[PDB]
Amino acid sequence: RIYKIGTKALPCSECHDVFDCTGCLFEEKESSHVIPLKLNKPNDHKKLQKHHESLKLGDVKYYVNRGEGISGSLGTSSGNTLDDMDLINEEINKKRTNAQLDNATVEQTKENIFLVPLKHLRDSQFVGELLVGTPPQTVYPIFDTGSTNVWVVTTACEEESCKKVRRYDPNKSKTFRRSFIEKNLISGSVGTDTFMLGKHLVRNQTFGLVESNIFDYISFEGIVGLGFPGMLSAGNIPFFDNLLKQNPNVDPQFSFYISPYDGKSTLIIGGISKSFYEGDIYMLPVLKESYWEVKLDELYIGKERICCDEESYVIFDTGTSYNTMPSSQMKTFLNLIHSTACTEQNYKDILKSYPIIKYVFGELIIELHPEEYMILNDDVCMPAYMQIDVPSERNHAYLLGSLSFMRNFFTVFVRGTESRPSMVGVARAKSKN
Amino acid sequence: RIYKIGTKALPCSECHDVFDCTGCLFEEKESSHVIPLKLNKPNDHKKLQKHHESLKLGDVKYYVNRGEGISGSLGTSSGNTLDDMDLINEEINKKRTNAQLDNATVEQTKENIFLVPLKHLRDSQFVGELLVGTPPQTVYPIFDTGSTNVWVVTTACEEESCKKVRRYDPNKSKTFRRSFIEKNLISGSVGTDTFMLGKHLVRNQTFGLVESNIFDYISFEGIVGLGFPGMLSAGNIPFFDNLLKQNPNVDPQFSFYISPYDGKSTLIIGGISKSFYEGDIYMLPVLKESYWEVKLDELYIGKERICCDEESYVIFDTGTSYNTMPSSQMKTFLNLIHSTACTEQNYKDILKSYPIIKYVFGELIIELHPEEYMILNDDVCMPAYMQIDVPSERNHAYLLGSLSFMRNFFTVFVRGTESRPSMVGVARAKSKN
Numbered sequence: 016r017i018y019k020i021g022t023k024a025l026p027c028s029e030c031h032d033v034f035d036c037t038g039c040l041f042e043e044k045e046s047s048h049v050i051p052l053k054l055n056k057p058n059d060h061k062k063l064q065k066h067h068e069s070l071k072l073g074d075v076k077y078y079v080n081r082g083e084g085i086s087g088s089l090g091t092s093s094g095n096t097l098d099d100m101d102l103i104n105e106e107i108n109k110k111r112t113n114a115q116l117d118n119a120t121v122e123q124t125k126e127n128i129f130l131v132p133l134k135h136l137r138d139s140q141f142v143g144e145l146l147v148g149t150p151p152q153t154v155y156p157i158f159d160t161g162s163t164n165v166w167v168v169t170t171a172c173e174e175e176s177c178k179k180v181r182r183y184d185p186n187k188s189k190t191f192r193r194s195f196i197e198k199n200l201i202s203g204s205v206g207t208d209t210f211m212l213g214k215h216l217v218r219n220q221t222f223g224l225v226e227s228n229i230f231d232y233i234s235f236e237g238i239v240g241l242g243f244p245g246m247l248s249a250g251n252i253p254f255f256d257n258l259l260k261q262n263p264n265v266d267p268q269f270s271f272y273i274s275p276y277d278g279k280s281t282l283i284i285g286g287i288s289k290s291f292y293e294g295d296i297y298m299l300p301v302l303k304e305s306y307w308e309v310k311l312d313e314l315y316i317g318k319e320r321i322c323c324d325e326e327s328y329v330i331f332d333t334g335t336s337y338n339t340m341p342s343s344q345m346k347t348f349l350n351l352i353h354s355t356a357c358t359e360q361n362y363k364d365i366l367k368s369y370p371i372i373k374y375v376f377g378e379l380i381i382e383l384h385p386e387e388y389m390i391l392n393d394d395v396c397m398p399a400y401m402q403i404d405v406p407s408e409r410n411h412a413y414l415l416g417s418l419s420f421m422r423n424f425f426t427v428f429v430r431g432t433e434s435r436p437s438m439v440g441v442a443r444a445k446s447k448n
Numbered sequence: 449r450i451y452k453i454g455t456k457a458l459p460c461s462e463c464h465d466v467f468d469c470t471g472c473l474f475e476e477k478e479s480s481h482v483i484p485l486k487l488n489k490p491n492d493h494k495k496l497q498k499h500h501e502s503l504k505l506g507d508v509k510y511y512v513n514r515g516e517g518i519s520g521s522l523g524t525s526s527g528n529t530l531d532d533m534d535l536i537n538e539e540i541n542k543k544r545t546n547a548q549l550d551n552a553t554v555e556q557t558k559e560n561i562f563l564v565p566l567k568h569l570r571d572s573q574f575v576g577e578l579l580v581g582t583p584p585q586t587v588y589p590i591f592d593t594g595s596t597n598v599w600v601v602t603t604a605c606e607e608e609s610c611k612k613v614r615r616y617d618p619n620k621s622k623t624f625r626r627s628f629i630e631k632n633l634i635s636g637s638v639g640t641d642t643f644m645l646g647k648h649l650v651r652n653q654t655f656g657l658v659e660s661n662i663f664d665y666i667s668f669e670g671i672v673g674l675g676f677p678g679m680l681s682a683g684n685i686p687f688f689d690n691l692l693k694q695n696p697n698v699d700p701q702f703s704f705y706i707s708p709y710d711g712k713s714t715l716i717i718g719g720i721s722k723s724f725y726e727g728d729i730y731m732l733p734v735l736k737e738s739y740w741e742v743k744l745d746e747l748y749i750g751k752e753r754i755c756c757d758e759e760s761y762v763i764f765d766t767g768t769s770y771n772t773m774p775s776s777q778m779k780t781f782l783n784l785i786h787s788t789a790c791t792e793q794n795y796k797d798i799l800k801s802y803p804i805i806k807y808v809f810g811e812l813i814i815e816l817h818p819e820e821y822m823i824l825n826d827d828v829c830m831p832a833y834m835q836i837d838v839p840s841e842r843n844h845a846y847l848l849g850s851l852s853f854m855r856n857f858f859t860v861f862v863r864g865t866e867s868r869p870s871m872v873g874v875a876r877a878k879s880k881n
């Protein structure tokens with residue numbers, strides 16, 4: 016559910032301070048620039064099951080750093096991915112069992128904490144058609160509000176023994192040019208080429224190229240960053256800014272409809288579609304233009320308030336599946352929300368007692384009921400949340416992703432211009448009925 | 449509630465292995481050796497409120513050692529008592545704010561944990577009349593299954609400016625003799641004298657003596673240990689063994705009825721009273737004869753199992769008010785059980801949703817419903833549990849005390865002889881109606 020408490024919400028045009036009126040109503044602009052999104056080709060949640068159980072003992076924290084993942088996403092230079100949960104668990108156990116082997120009086124002492132750096136969190140299952148070069152080659156990248164640059168996996172292969180599959184070969188483009196870089200970046204390089212997204216042409220687009228078969232290491236064909244221009248882009252016009260500069264009649268906004276079980280998922284450039292949501296679109300101001308990052312005031316699990324006594328922020332990250340909470344909040348969470356047997360028809364009765372999760376931004380309230388944050392895995396119901404600490408800043412980051420948040424809320428990302436700041440819009444998604 | 453699952457419980461006489469038949473039914477023996485217990489003169493639970501909040505941050509553990517408290521009870525040689533929660537909290541904050549100032553890759557690191565050693569846990573509010581010496585002087589000690597020796601606070605004072613109060617002066621006894629000790633023990637010494645407990649005379653009883661006004665440091669007039677003979681008694685016949693040797697018709701058992709709001713609380717020597725309990729008395733074998741310590745199999749808070757994957761034991765400790773759990777279990781507990789506003793008549797409606805706490809010993813089940821483990825403090829409902837770690841042994845100890853457990857269950861302590869092992873008996877207390 017989404018609603019504003021207090022005074023009835025008003026159009027954002029009627030605001031006094033555009034930076035302070037959380038929960039105002041967005042002017043809806045219908046757009047015809049639709050980009051269908053499809054399932055990326057495995058939907059296996061055993062990785063998240065193991066991740067939860069590895070937190071049972073209370074001494075394990077997963078973390079990522081701001082900007083250090085592929086394309087400027089959250090990550091580290093480690094080799095750990097979430098797909099590596101059995102290697103990770105084996106190492107955790109080895110490390111723990113080697114340490115247990117190796118007027119008022121209070122006594123300071125040290126406990127062992129095991130940190131698991133994650134390489135990146137890029138694991139959305141929804142990809143869209145991108146056309147690259149001349150004559151055009153089709154790739155299916157993730158469209159990622161949590162990334163800044165464009166990256167494409169190259170799979171060029173001229174030998175006769177190469178498997179016959181759809182490949183992206185930058186040298187088959189008449190218009191591809193390789194750029195000169197003085198940074199030794201599985202290998203990375205930078206080039207430029209022409210792209211087509213939907214009906215929009217985007218020339219002179221700088222992008223990174225990943226070469227080695229290579230999909231043993233990588234789980235996406237590409238990343239189109241929809242973040243902000245800044246140090247993380249390094250003078251290279253990001254894709255969406257480049258689109259806007261070359262297609263001047265497009266309003267600087269894009270929206271996302273995630274409908275996993277209908278095949279109707281969609282990215283919309285330059286506007287929204289009234290058929291994707293119910294009610295109004297409620298606006299949150301972006302506090303730090305880097306990720307799409309919004310100040311978080313409180314967070315409730317039922318009656319229990321778990322946040323926020325310190326500075327907290329929610330990142331809307333379309334390129335990641337799960338929601339996240341920091342390590343202290345997930346202690347409470349995993350005590351309050353249990354995985355259970357669900358079958359598939361017993362599920363509405365099982366979850367009848369689970370608690371509502373309530374995010375509070377000013378007077379704007381976003382609820383996730385249990386059939387909105389629980390997912391099915393074999394015959395087991397599971398909460399679609401990961402424990403992720405973002406230590407980079409003294410503040411605490413929460414992530415809202417595609418499997419839980421966006422499947423239930425229609426989301427609008429509005430770039431701030433000369434007559435508006437950057438904002439995220441949210442509306443109840445169209446009810447599948 | 450108390451009940452046995454599986455086969456219907458049978459009298460303990462019908463057992464095969466007397467060490468293995470948990471939940472058998474005790475032969476009831478009525479006894480006339482009743483010792484009324486009264487409220488000790490302040491019933492202030494603000495100390496436990498502060499104790500709970502000092503655990504909020506997850507980095508503070510209270511601990512006691514086996515045998516190191518007064519009379520061989522649980523404690524340490526520190527000066528911290530629970531009455532010192534403001535000194536304790538001030539030190540915790542000072543220590544914390546001085547430290548924040550001063551194929552698979554996992555990363556070991558250290559977190560700070562603050563340990564708070566507690567001097568002792570002797571805080572029951574129920575005391576009984578003991579007569580000491582010739583002509584007899586009245587003291588009101590705690591009768592303490594968690595202690596081993598007899599200790600009495602001496603308050604001798606011959607100066608004219610001494611306050612006129614009931615004092616215990618060992619030198620006013622014609623039969624008191626001071627013993628020779630080679631251990632510098634506020635000061636301690638040992639003597640012997642004659643005691644009377646109820647109708648039973650106990651001559652040649654060795655006991656410790658505490659001298660300094662002295663009740664600024666101590667909160668009890670004395671301790672009569674009802675533990676076991678062993679190293680912690682050091683060749684000095686403990687009180688109850690001495691009673692039995694000199695009064696040979698007394699069966700080696702004693703029982704406790706705790707009725708705080710009726711003035712009907714009672715210790716019963718040599719048997720029980722059928723008017724203090726409903727249903728049958730269910731027997732648990734004592735696994736380690738030192739404290740009255742019983743093996744614990746599982747512990748549930750509602751549907752959630754919090755114990756036991758490692759060796760756990762319950763200590764029945766009549767000299768302490770609150771129940772306890774180790775530090776890891778109270779993390780879960782304080783997330784699942786909250787303090788709240790209660791008034792005094794709103795209480796049955798408030799607690800309607802709280803979870804049942806279930807202790808599991810073999811097939812014997814002991815439940816505490818919320819109106820049995822919650823107590824009132826001002827207009828606030830609070831759980832009568834402390835976090836106590838007993839690090840002395842690799843195993844984990846749980847305490848059951850007087851304010852919660854014994855107020856709701858009638859308890860029988862049965863000394864093991866040539867034709868029985870030591871056992872604790874439990875029955876639902878007589879319903880006040």
Ligand SMILES: *[C@@H]1O[C@H](CO)[C@@H](O)[C@H](O)[C@H]1NC(C)=O
Binds near residue numbers: 219221250
């Ligand atoms: C191509 O894009 C770059 C940004 O990386 C810009 O500075 C440059 O002027 C553009 N060149 C042309 C020919 O559009």
Ligand SMILES: *[C@@H]1O[C@H](CO)[C@@H](O)[C@H](O)[C@H]1NC(C)=O
Binds near residue numbers: 654684685
């Ligand atoms: C007094 O008690 C002690 C135990 O501390 C015992 O060894 C001794 O024999 C007793 N003496 C008499 C006279 O009863």
